[PDB]
Each structure stands twice: as structure tokens, then as C-alpha cells.
């Protein structure tokens, strides 16, 4: 149900942060397209 | 009008995120000094 980034060698699940993203003005149906934001920023 | 970071080899414009910044308590008039924040964080 949730979403997590991980390293390429160690299985270490962790919540996605704001500094591991790339914003692009294109998506071509090879994605997931969640209706809500999945950045998980802070208050 | 807008502002974008880019890589040093490929012309690929993209919005500036929160994890590509360095906060320093100094600026010496070799800057732009926008009155509004240009971090573009998320809700």
C-alpha cells in the first residue's frame, strides 16, 4: 500500500523525502499516477 | 521569469527542490535577492 525508496544493494526500506525527487512536466502512462502527493514533507 | 536548476552537461530544465540548497548567513550583492521564497516545497 505505501511507497518507499531503497538503495541498489541493501534492502532497506525508508520513506521518500523531498531531496530525492526530479520534477518533470511530462508523464507517458509508464507510471502510477497517485491522485495525492507522495512527497511526505514536514510541518 | 521563472528559475530552474540544470545539470552541467545536458540542457534539462527542472524546478528547484528542497534538497539542492545550501543555507548561508551571508550575501554580498553578487546574487538576485528575490523578495519571495523560491524553494517550491509541497503541501
Amino acid at each position: 500500500g505505501s511507497y518507499y525508496i531503497t538503495a541498489r544493494d541493501m534492502y532497506m526500506p525508508r520513506a521518500i523525502t523531498a531531496g530525492d525527487i526530479v520534477t518533470l512536466t511530462s508523464c507517458q502512462a509508464n507510471y502510477v499516477s497517485v491522485n495525492k502527493t507522495v512527497i511526505t514533507t514536514f510541518v
Side-chain angles (χ1 to χ4, degrees), chain A residues 1-27 29-43:
Chain A
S2 298
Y3 296 99
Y4 299 101
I5 73 106
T6 186
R8 294 178 68 248
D9 291 327
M10 185 180 289
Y11 180 74
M12 185 176 177
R14 50 178 286 164
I16 181 166
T17 185
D20 295 333
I21 60 170
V22 172
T23 63
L24 293 174
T25 61
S26 176
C27 75
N30 193 359
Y31 294 94
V32 179
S33 70
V34 181
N35 56 2
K36 292 181 180 180
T37 62
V38 289
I39 296 97
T40 67
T41 184
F42 298 96
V43 300

